[model samples]
Target chain A: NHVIFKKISRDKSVTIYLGKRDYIDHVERVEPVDGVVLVDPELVKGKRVYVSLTCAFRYGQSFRRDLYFSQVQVFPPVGASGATTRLQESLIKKLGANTYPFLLTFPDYLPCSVMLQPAPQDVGKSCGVDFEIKAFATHSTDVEEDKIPKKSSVRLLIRKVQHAPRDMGPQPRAEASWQFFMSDKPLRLAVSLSKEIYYHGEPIPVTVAVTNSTEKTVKKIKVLVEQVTNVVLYSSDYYIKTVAAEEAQEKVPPNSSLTKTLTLVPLLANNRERRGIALDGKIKHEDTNLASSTIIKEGIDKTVMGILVSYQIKVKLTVSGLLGELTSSEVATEVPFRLMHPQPEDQDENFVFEEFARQNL
Target chain B: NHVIFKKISRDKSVTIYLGKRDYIDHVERVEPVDGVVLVDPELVKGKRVYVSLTCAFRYGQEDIDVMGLSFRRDLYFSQVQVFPPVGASGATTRLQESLIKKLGANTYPFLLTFPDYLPCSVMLQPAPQDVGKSCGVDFEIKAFATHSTDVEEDKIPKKSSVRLLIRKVQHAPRDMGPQPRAEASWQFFMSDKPLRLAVSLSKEIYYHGEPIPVTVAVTNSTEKTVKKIKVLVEQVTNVVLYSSDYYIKTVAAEEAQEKVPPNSSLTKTLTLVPLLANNRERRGIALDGKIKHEDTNLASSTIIKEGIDKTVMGILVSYQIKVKLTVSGLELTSSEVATEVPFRLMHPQPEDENFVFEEFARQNL
Candidate 1:
């Protein structure tokens, strides 16, 4: 909807009330959200003053990209009678001042506020998507040769965040196969995880079934868990952790089936020696794992400033031929799982912006 | 001086002499000279064994073997002398008599403490096929008793004797406080319009993820406009011993870019948390140190207590914030004026005062 913008100057006091912090459309409802502006008629007696809503983003001081969303005139309505009736006595009493109610309708495709990664050498925090809502006033006589307004303006920062819908249960079994020139038959592998969703410290039960039908004998089996972290800024990937890892040497016959269930629980303790691994979608000092997988909408509509975290299980069958000294074959299966913080069994969390402060720009 | 390596085995008794573990410049001397080792002729007779000193590093599972020495002239330096006293006639002191009594048999006391701060003893995780070691670096001295000393290097068996990993460890000195106040000025980028920046941090010392409060004062004098200001915390590792470049951000607070008008002065305080916890994927960002061996991110900051000894400094973890001001121009080609101030980041040790200990606890929680 809209948020309130207040600008108090030495000469006058200006207050405009608008939508919520951001126009959050949770249950999918589209309606006209109303905003109110309060002004002292005595201060604006015969002056031409109006209230408007503007949304813009800034890239440092040099690049100021202002998108012409929409604006409205608050004073001297074309139909004073109809506009005057819009201000109800109940609101005036509640606000303790004269108020003007206005409606704002923006396209659903309006991009969310985001701060992109800054340059390597750029100091401080520069370069990120930022959305601002500002309201200012000017004297009628000051409108000579209209360009961009020069008058001081008061603005508020807002963000638009959407939770993409996706399945959160256990993913399906993933399978892979490999064949060697020495054997006519192929080595088959199938992996199944406990569930697609998991909290940190919760044991992850992985079932890996391997069937060797080749002539090459299986010397040993090893299971490895790898944690991958992506740096959204550079769009790069780095292995952050080696999750549940175990190996064994058990010679299996030419034709045999091996089913092993391994339980792995990822802990920050085990990864203390690890570098650059981020859990949650956030990289703050707080306890968080890499964020869950989500649709990364291009800036056309939504701006995302987060990293996506996923997991997979690698099952290796060290197949060795009489001549092949130490050649090994393995299968890697993508396990759909979300690593997240443990949520309160009966409580819910909400969108928070206390950590997001207004940039100097 | 040389150290005797005696390999005790049922088949044979093997003893070989080798040089010292600590290196010397030959021309310049700084550290204390190492002592010698001795082996009784009877103890080493008919023994098949040798000793070795190896220096190596592991980047992952791959080990880069650098040097292995078993020779005497190439390894040892000046030797000392020993004597036997008859009824303590030449030396009547109690010490001389005790030395003569104990020296009757084989007794060896070599350099026991591995060089400090090199890399602490770490047992790395076992690798696939045991090809790679989880540990990053290791320096060791080994003595083995083999069937024959002339056998190939790989033929040396692990029977007796020992392999000790050397570690150069250091604990932070007590009573060290924050060192602040760093400044820089820029006039070239602004065309004689000088922009002077003076930055002060809350302290010089920090824990792993403590919030660093940076207070910056900027004074601009000239015709051009001061567009924006940026402050970044960068990790710096002093690679003096390695003789290689050892240095290496997420936007912690990338603080909101604020504008500083020309001919005006502005000041602001920003908070940033340079956390090693999140840099598990980046090499330099994690604050972990590795030369031939690995250390934890929370490893104590390397500090050579004193340089009197030929103290070769090791990996030093530090941090500094660069403050920059971008001058406005038509092409936006305005160059940035920047300055950096150094600080320290280390783990909590026993000697650290209670306040620092409490602060470290609060941040971790």
Candidate 2:
């Protein structure tokens, strides 16, 4: 943009001051030039304004790898306010980090081609006023309670993934597979002593009692990922923030029995399940119900829980579907021919495998 | 403390009946001596009888130390019906490591003692029946709640200071101080990461209009002790078992004050306070509340705490009297000369180094 200056009416003995905030992209970082002001008809100095946005990336990289919207702070000027609408879909899509670098060099000193405009005039004469920009994740408040919790004692704000490509809100389906932390915020799972203490020689029980902090019980609670055990993360913050996580992963198919016994590597000869490693969890209550999926409209057993899909803001949804589909499903079948129905003729050993399935599935 | 075996009579035929038990003291070691029949006794035999409670102090510097009955455990030789008096005053205070000398002497014995006459009597038994002296600590219930919870919950039984002391029947006021981890009957405090994220830096504020799970409140409540933040730890177990300590002593006093704020700390910090620790103050409490003290016939303030004048059952008693006697017989005139007084002021400021007294004593004021 060109700076326009007003001249002095030497005859009238009055010099009117005129400035152009006109077509200004940014007024703070103006073009630098060696200059002196002259109120004569032909002496006005001006330069181009350069503004650019760069992409985010990893170490030595040029573009960002993950998709997330942390917050962005923008300083308009001295007496400014924040602006939300200034963000663009492009920036929303590929925005890396705020530390991204961008360079802009003007081809010619014409501002209009850059879509630069004097902020607004008639209604907005306060050109000296500033603006701000901040980015924050928007939470869903009016989420339906069908599968999600409403005014739930435990509330969770979680992103939902569904069979369809569309992002689904927190809704429990009878057949869907889902998972999340007991609390809306995730706890670290470092394979530190306690979390990773398991016996490999014998499939030891890695019982984790995940209490639903939400007033509403979660539906189809399932654990999907497993980290290795006894991980030594050495940040002073490890113990301070309760950050290290356990290494055992709860990997069972949908609809597996509750109280699953995991086959642990009974630790090494030196390493075994240290005392205080087993988590206490029992199906004390059966209120956590999920939105019934069309494929699986109803749950066959209450004892067996799936991933929790229905969640409130306090309790993130983590639905665990039992693996009735697994070859292990035969554990529930009847008789020797059925391979699952063990000794119906004799005292049923079905309970043995059933108990095993409850703990190890 | 004696074993007598009687054989069957003439009509009872060959009468080759035999049986007995051997009792044990916690801080000592014992071995089986006599035999019901010398037959198998000779094969397995060492006929020396009465249990030898040999105190092997490596240093041999015994200057009169009675067994405190704090962290002691006794093992049995066989699986049989057994029990000691419910209120039997037996609790161990040894720190487990203190017995290393006994363990290293090729005397790594499991069952501390067996009853000769009372062949299977046991004083202290853990809640879960599956655990034994050989079980270690991991498999035991309620034992992992110690600083080393990363240790398996059952193996703790083999180790002292870390056994699951759940559901033990201790005589009243006997096993009242907090139980050690190995002997603890609960597991919450003994777990790896007691707090959310192991340690949560930020205080999570629950806002109004937020529909949350009731469990969330409980988790927060449970975490009050672990996180040591301004939260309420109202859980029954936490209040009773943690020994005036929260699941985790995560914050210091000032940091605790900042985290839970002072006023909140007073209220919330109460959650983690161990109940048994309060037992130590029970004596002081009784004296203050007159629960154990009796008023004198002549004076109300002159109180005496009974059953305390003498040292009974390892207890010592002493009295402190606050007297106020005036020497009315002797008199000194209160001269009104605008005189300086140096007796001492009743009230003192923190900065004051010395006291300021009143004017001269008078028989009549």
Candidate 3:
């Protein structure tokens, strides 16, 4: 069984088809972006048809400039692999002679897909990286990009993503204590996470334990998942945003102990308007989740990294005393963990054959 | 005799003149920012000439735009008719009278006032490669010839408009008779004795770029041995709007070689200089405010008028000297005997008696 994803130009003369849009970067090797272009030769009027794949990086609203990779031309084939692949042969048979297949490769040193979250008041497109595939009919191959007519070309946005690491450490845990001037004993608080690594959309469970031996009584407990984004390129500019939070009223009286578990899910849907929240770089039409936790290599310098992202689960305990809220004391603990996309199974290459329907384009 | 103060537009169509660029903000009242504008009749072609004074608060780089909210916000704006003078306009000040007589009919005099609650000049220290204006509260006077005064800022043609930056600052209070001092003591558990620390400044006020002398004394009666002492000058910035605070160590000195044994006392005086040269790598350091392409010194200490709400005073800066003593004990414990003394940092008043307008007049003649 064969499935096709297609995008058409506004003029209804050019169409771009691909088996899938998602491409994986295996660190050592990246999956080549391959697709098929079907154009109406009569509508183009015998002009040369050109297809290009571009990776663009954009940041900040006022400085609206793009740092794009070298565009790879696929149509009017210059490479030796033209018409050699099975998907190319099948696309030709199913879509008639007007179909042309293209394959684009990425450079090894290209940056990964990452985005800096924008603030709520920020308008227009936020900071992110995007990949686009364009197919157009042009009279001259060297014509300026701006001179090309918008309606005569079709553009499709795609993504290149990474997966979670296989080797993860143990579950994270942190403990804190608070001591008053008059009291001899101190209140102890401990927090822990369910596991070491969490995938996107997965629930993160946090456990909080409080032992109150002092004269103070525990009044309430709160747990929060905070995303910390550090823009290290310029200054030490950083933002700490609370992505998820939960409050509990279960109290622990003096000389008693209590333990409870709370669950929170940090989803981009809940924080769409919150500015400076980091996310995976995205295309125009595709949906993206929060940016994955940045994993640094051993002995690598962290300050030079342009943008650094980290996540932590914080637990706070509020204690009350005879002075009422005035003497109320609070203690907090933080536990850091990794949030990433799980590695996908089935790495072997396989080609599925299917017929392209005229109505789909 | 009259002084010719002028800022010409790039195309030479309009020139804005001000008697003085520095205005003082007295607690009870503020000095008015008045200026004169001269326009070429031929260049204007009968269009109305307008002069506007605007106070802009820019907190970040103009080139860095986030979710659509701009970093620069206008806090004060007032436009006055210059070509067609209102009702009566003989002259308010001596400079205005002198300029009107010298420049003849083409000169138009205008005056602008500041609101009561506006914040004083202050800026956040920016890092290297910070493109464009980093952050500050600035005042600008602009003159242009337009069909209507309702035109937007960016829509006004740059060639026909001339803008100049000005400063609004405050000087130290006249009565500086009090000496600043602070003391702190630490009590030891299961012991009757306590260690006490006290710090005092030479005076209540200090000028910019001047060395501050701080007297530190430590009286230790506890069984703990005082290992070392450290003195630091801290520049505290409070973002009242967000209820956030930042403390930066502008000057630091440590005395590891000298120690006070149990039942002994130590007294020493340390002189420290707080400068921007040592704090270039620090983040959120407050400085004297400026617009784009201008240099500034350390931020002056904030002073508020009576009955003014502290929350409305956006960013508040203050300076303090801290002295701490490190102590060693048998329980593997360290006792900190610390004290903080607050002092005012301000700009010294200019000694010259002549007004800026008078000085300009003498220079031009």
**DockQ for each model:** 0.01, 0.00, 0.01
Name model 1 segments beyond 4 Å from true.
Answer: A1-12, A16-19, A25-35, A40-68, A75-93, A102-106, A110-128, A146-152, A164-173, A180-331, A335-361, B1-365
Q: Lowest summed-lDDT stretch of 10 residues in model 3 chain A?
A: A352-361
Cα lDDT, model 3, residue A158? 67
Residues B34-101 of candidate 1: C-alpha lDDT, one tens digit per residue: 22223444644555333344434333333458343221111112211221212212223332233334
lDDT per residue (tens digit) for residues A1-361 in model 1: 1123333433444455543544432213222335555666775554444544454544443554455366666554335513322332334444654566556554544433333232343232333334444445555445464222334234545444333223456475788887665457887877888677666567777776666666665566666666654434323333344656756323344544445566677664565442344332122333323333333434543233333345655666666663344344343455656554443222212222132232221
Model 2 C-alpha lDDT per residue in residues A1-361, reported as the tens digit of each score: 3232222332222122112111111211222111111112221112111122111112110212211222221211112222222122222222222211111221211111100011122111111011111111112334552221121111111111111111222322112122233434321111101221111122322233232222222232222122111101111110001101223222212111112112222221221222111111111212111111111124332111111111110111232232332122311100000000011111111111011011211
* Shift of residue B225 alpha carbon in model 3, Å: 2.8
Q: State the displacement of the C-alpha of residue A335, model 3, in Å, after optimal TM-score superposition.
A: 7.2
> Compared with the true structure, what per-residue lDDT tens digits does model 3 show for residues A180-233?
767788888888887988887898878777777776667677899899877544
Which candidate number would show the highest TM-score if scored against the true structure?
3
lDDT of 3 at A284: 31
**Descending-DockQ candidate ranking:** 3, 1, 2
